Write a protein that binds this ligand. Structure first.
Ligand code: NDP
Ligand code: ZMP
Ligand code: ZN
Lengths: 340, 114, 208, 95, 86, 134, 126
């Protein structure tokens, strides 16, 4: 343990937390709050970015001077990964996509890239490698996302024996695509679902709890080789979840069922442009996929992180969608969604 | 031992002023959650008001608790008028700060501060 | 002592001595000390109950007419049992003159506000609340004037450190400017610069 | 005369170089470690030892008020040259 | 399980330690010969009240106030300490 | 190995040869993960399940006063009487004087500059020994 | 009447705005500062001073500077007498320890003692 990485200070902003983190995909939704919580401890955070550097500007106030190092990388480049991970004592991978593109499909993003990152972190002597899979990862799954993510989870395990693999169920926050997916389908016609969305059961997890779990797994030596499943404290159906989303947003709610006959074809109806697709058929198969319950895998409470419910933070997520006539309202307005 | 008071001649008038200030904050908290459009409940704000009043529940000097009532009414004047913002109200909730180690063993583990 | 040494004004020294005797014997109820410095400035050190009867005198007496409140000041000296020292700099435009009126308080004793004499003080003693914690009774709008709204403490007191106790940063989790306890990337280095040799024998104090 | 560490990193004139296991080389990943390749201790070795016939030599560094304060150097030691404390120019008495 | 050490705090000029001083000028030597490997730490201080600390097994320390006692009372308290052995 | 603190690096009571207890003040902090000594011993008591009745340094000094009160009374030599009773206890068993003459371990200036763990790890003291052996 | 009678203790700890950690866990030190033995001048040994314990200074990883987290690390207060410092420390709730004023005792200076007849205090040279 070198003298420059010995933990000093009171754990504040300008202290030395003793954590050198290479956070792949830190420019996304999870990496934003992860670099937020790491840099307020005074951690050396290496951010390898693929996108425009302007889309990394919000990562700059998140830590003290010389605590965030931005650098380029390519997904098919082991030289850039060796150039990044060689100084770190922890590597956290967060590379993901809700949609497949021309250049990167799900096999590139989930199977090839995390295996390459974990192989380079292994042959450069990185102590801790944390991978972020999805709770519904299944080889036999009906969606390409979950199949490729389970294959990539298997490969990350078989090329890094001490990999801490973390299973969030459904992450919500200010910049999510879970509650903001539900809230931004209002002018399309009435929020279509399969069997009115009451045959699938979910338990969403809050992003600050996910981040606290990842960082308390960084600081736990007993999380080496473990596999975690970060789930919320309460399980909802999907229908009363969407009820509660439109009821916090103070929006009209007129649902209608939409079966197999054309709701897989609204995928190819709504990625006709090369932009970000508003919804895709993989997202269709994953919204209507229930969250599995794995009692054998540890969760948030086994890392000492209190799972915050949706009834405390749904107002914070969904105040953005209220028009004006119910912006100034209260949290004591909405009767909460029924658990199962 | 003969000093000059501020408002209260003894502890009873001082507790009367503390009690009127608590009444005023308890009336103010729902409007504070409403117009600032905070992300907490009204009961959580009332709990924070209770904690901030119980923080100073040990003083037996009338001038000190008179000045605490004066400073609390200055806080209330800055709350009723929108002079504070969402940030100045939510500074009472030490949220971004990590919980400090309280027991001896974890303070021994992380630092030198007793 | 002609080129470098400042030329002493003995006429103004004698006139301020005579006017200090004048003020000291018109108001013996409150005036404690009267002193004139070497550069001929007058201080009427009084009792803090006599804020209004002295300052209304100097504003309204025909030989004083100290119409302009130049500067209201507090000075923290923690070695005294009434540590704060309230200073009134007054200007008489009629007699082309400047006087100083000094008094004392501790943290808890309220000083009488002088807005009924000089409305110019309406902010200044407000600043003395904001910086020193000196309360001013019967003030119209007494609150903070120079610090942040949720700021805890009185900064210009000498038991308050140079850097504060909290510092700010923008936090992207709560999307909000938050206050953490202060940490410096470099400590404010303290320079012990006092020479160990007595610079001025005229200001020598008698020993214990 | 800059010399390079076994890690591939240049060494300053002080001698500061980060060790191989130190993470703080990551600030130079993709960038450069700016050192000055004109070392003062090597440029003052190249100056010739000035022979004077005096016993005490005065040095101000050249330039008058553009140099250092004028100091007086004793040259009684026939073994050792009298190095100026400011400029490093060393003087020798020729007897 | 038994007595392990004795501590006797007292003063030089205080009259409250006076008989305690009269315990040491007259009754310490034949105490120490009767307890050869029992450390009996005599500690003289400036203005303390007299005291008898009796440390027993497993750190159990019991406390006796020897303030204003005579030499016979200090002798009786110390021999009750020696006889009890908690 | 339990990494402890040094005399400039902790607040600490040392008693000189005349009985005058004196406290050091913290100048710098111990390097690395090294902690103050009684902090380490108290945390070891907290691990093992035999927690000692002190938490702060003042409580250590209250315990230290309970052991002997002339350890927390600083810059004070407390006069110790009763030489006669220690003499009468000394005359019990006759231990015999050896015929080896009294020789101190520090004869010259060579043997002075390296005595403890701090002086032997010093390069200044090493230059002093190298410069007095010549 | 225009006065009250406060029988209780003068204590302003709730008014100063100091956090609790920098009230109870600190140790104020009340001391006449020792003479810098580089210099025979004694004007630095006149007034009493109040410092605190020195907390942790660590290396800034960027520049090697002395980063610190103690706000009261540079706070050195000046008091003309000792009991003013004691009353000030009692007033703010700071736990204080006091060193006494170490004064040099007067020495017997005699220039003729350097040239005695039968005494050892003859100087060997001048
Ligand atoms: N609901 C959720 O958010 C859940 C997410 N997860 C997983 O957690 C991780 C983080 O999620 P989240 O932040 O929300 O997703 P995002 O899509 O918002 O973030 C992905 C990050 O990885 C980068 N990235 C994406 N694709 C590539 C690529 N092909 N090559 C290189 N970099 C790439 C992105 O940067 P750039 O701008 O360059 O593309 C971005 O920084 C993902 O692995 C995701 O699968 C798991 C469960 C739930
Ligand atoms: C959003 C949050 C907003 C936060 C608002 C912060 C305002 C804080 C104001 C602080 C002012 C005070 O603390 S005044 C209290 C001082 N009073 C005393 O010391 C006297 C003791 N008082 C008490 O015990 C009080 O509970 C009572 C009710 C006055 C008497 O109760 P007793 O019975 O026992
Ligand atoms: Zn020169």
């Amino acid at each position: 343990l070198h003298h420059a990485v010995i933990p000093h200070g009171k754990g504040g902003r300008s202290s030395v937390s003793g954590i050198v983190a290479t956070v792949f995909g830190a420019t996304g939704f999870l990496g934003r709050y992860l670099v937020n919580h790491l840099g307020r401890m005074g951690s050396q955070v290496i951010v390898p970015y693929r996108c425009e550097p302007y889309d990394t500007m919000h990562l700059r106030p998140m830590g003290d001077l010389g605590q965030i190092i931005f650098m380029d990388w390519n997904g098919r480049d082991k030289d850039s990964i060796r150039r990044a991970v060689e100084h770190s004592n922890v590597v956290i991978n967060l590379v993901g996509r809700e949609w497949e593109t021309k250049n990167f499909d799900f096999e590139d993003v989930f199977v090839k890239i995390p295996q390459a990152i974990a192989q380079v972190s292994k042959e450069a002597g990185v102590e801790k490698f944390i991978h972020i899979s999805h709770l519904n990862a299944d080889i036999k799954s009906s969606s390409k996302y979950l199949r490729n993510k389970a294959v990539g989870e298997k490969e990350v395990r078989e090329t890094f024996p001490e990999a801490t693999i973390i299973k969030p169920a459904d992450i919500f926050g200010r910049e999510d695509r879970f509650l903001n997916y539900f809230a931004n389908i209002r002018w399309f016609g009435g929020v279509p679902l399969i069997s009115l969305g009451k045959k699938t059961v979910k338990q969403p997890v809050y992003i600050v709890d996910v981040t606290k779990g990842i960082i308390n797994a960084i600081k736990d030596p007993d999380a080496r080789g473990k596999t975690f499943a970060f789930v919320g404290p309460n399980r909802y159906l999907l229908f009363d979840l969407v009820q509660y989303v439109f009821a916090v947003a103070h929006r009209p709610f007129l649902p209608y069922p939409m079966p197999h006959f054309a709701y897989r074809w609204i995928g190819r109806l709504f990625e006709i442009s090369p932009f970000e697709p508003w919804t895709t058929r993989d997202k269709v198969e994953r919204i209507h996929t229930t969250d599995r319950t794995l009692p054998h895998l540890p969760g948030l409470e086994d890392l000492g992180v209190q799972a915050t419910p949706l009834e405390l933070k749904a107002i914070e997520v969904l105040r953005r969608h209220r028009t004006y006539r119910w912006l100034s309202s209260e949290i004591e307005d909405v009767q909460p969604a029924k658990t199962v | 031992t003969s000093v000059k008071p501020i408002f209260s001649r003894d502890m009873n008038e001082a507790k009367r002023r503390v009690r009127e200030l608590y009444r005023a904050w308890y009336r103010e908290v729902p409007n504070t959650v409403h117009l600032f459009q905070l992300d907490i409940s009204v009961k959580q704000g009332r709990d924070k008001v209770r904690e901030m009043f119980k923080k100073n529940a040990h003083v037996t000097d009338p001038r000190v608790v008179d000045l605490l009532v004066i400073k609390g009414k200055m806080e209330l004047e800055e709350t009723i008028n929108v002079w504070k913002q969402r940030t100045h109200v939510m500074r009472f909730f030490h949220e971004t700060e990590a919980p400090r180690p309280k027991d001896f063993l974890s303070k021994f583990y992380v630092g030198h501060d007793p | 002592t002609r080129p470098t040494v400042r030329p002493r004004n003995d006429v103004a020294h004698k006139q301020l001595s005579a006017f200090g005797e004048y003020v000291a014997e018109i108001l013996p109820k409150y005036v404690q000390q009267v002193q004139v410095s070497c550069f001929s400035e007058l201080e009427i050190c009084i009792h803090p109950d006599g804020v209004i009867p002295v300052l209304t005198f100097l504003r309204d007496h025909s030989n004083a007419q100290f119409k302009s409140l130049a500067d209201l000041t507090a000075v923290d000296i923690p070695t005294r049992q009434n540590r704060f020292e309230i200073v009134y700099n007054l200007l008489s435009l009629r007699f082309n003159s400047r006087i100083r009126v000094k008094t004392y308080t501790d943290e808890l004793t309220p000083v009488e506000s002088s807005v009924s004499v000089y409305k110019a003080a309406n902010w200044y003693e407000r600043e003395i609340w904001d910086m020193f914690g000196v309360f001013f009774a019967n003030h119209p709008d007494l609150r903070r004037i120079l610090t942040d709204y949720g700021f805890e403490g009185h900064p210009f007191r000498k038991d308050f450190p140079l850097s504060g106790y909290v510092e700010l940063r923008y936090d992207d989790e709560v999307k909000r400017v938050v206050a953490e306890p202060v940490e410096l990337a470099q400590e404010f280095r303290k320079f012990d610069l006092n020479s160990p040799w007595e610079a001025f024998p005229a200001y020598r104090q008698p020993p214990e | 005369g800059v010399r390079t560490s076994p890690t591939g990193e240049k060494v300053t004139h002080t001698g500061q170089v980060y060790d191989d296991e130190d993470y703080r080389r990551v600030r130079f990943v993709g960038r450069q470690k700016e050192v000055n390749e004109n070392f003062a201790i090597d440029l003052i070795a190249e100056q010739p030892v000035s022979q004077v016939g005096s016993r005490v030599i005065s040095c101000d560094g050249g330039g008058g008020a553009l140099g250092h304060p004028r100091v007086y150097i004793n040259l009684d030691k026939e073994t050792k040259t009298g190095t100026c404390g400011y400029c490093g120019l060393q003087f020798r008495q020729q007897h | 399980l038994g007595l392990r050490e004795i501590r006797i705090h007292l003063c030089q000029r205080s009259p409250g330690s006076q008989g305690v001083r009269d315990f040491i000028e007259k009754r310490y030597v034949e105490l120490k010969k009767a307890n050869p490997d029992l450390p009996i730490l005599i500690r003289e201080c400036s203005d303390v009240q007299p005291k008898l600390w009796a440390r027993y097994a497993f750190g159990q320390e019991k406390n006796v106030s020897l303030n204003n006692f005579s030499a016979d009372q200090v002798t009786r308290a110390l021999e009750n300490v020696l006889s009890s052995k908690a | 190995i339990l990494p402890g603190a040094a005399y400039t690096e902790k607040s600490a009571t040392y008693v000189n040869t005349e009985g005058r207890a004196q406290q050091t003040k913290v100048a710098v902090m111990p390097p690395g993960l090294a902690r103050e000594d009684w902090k380490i011993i108290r945390a070891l008591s907290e691990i093992a399940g035999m927690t000692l009745p002190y938490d702060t340094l003042d409580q250590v000094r209250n315990r230290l006063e309970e052991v002997s009160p002339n350890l927390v009374r600083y810059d004070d030599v407390e006069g110790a009487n009763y030489f006669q009773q220690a003499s009468e206890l000394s005359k019990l068993v006759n231990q015999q004087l050896l015929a080896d003459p009294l020789v101190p371990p520090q004869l010259t200036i060579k043997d002075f500059y390296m005595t403890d763990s701090i002086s032997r790890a010093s390069q200044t003291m090493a230059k002093c020994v190298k410069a007095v052996t010549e | 009447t225009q006065l009250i009678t406060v029988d209780e203790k003068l204590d302003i700890t709730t008014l100063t705005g100091v956090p609790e950690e920098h009230i109870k866990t600190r140790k104020a030190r009340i001391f006449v500062p020792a003479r810098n033995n580089m210099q025979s001048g004694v004007n630095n040994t006149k007034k009493w001073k109040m410092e605190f314990d020195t907390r942790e200074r660590w290396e800034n990883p960027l520049m090697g500077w002395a980063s610190t987290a103690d706000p009261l690390s540079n706070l050195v207060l000046t008091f003309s007498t000792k009991e003013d410092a004691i009353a000030f420390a009692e007033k703010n709730g700071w736990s204080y320890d006091v060193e006494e004023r170490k004064v040099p005792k007067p020495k017997s200076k005699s220039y003729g003692a350097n040239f005695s007849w039968n005494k050892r205090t003859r100087v060997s040279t001048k």
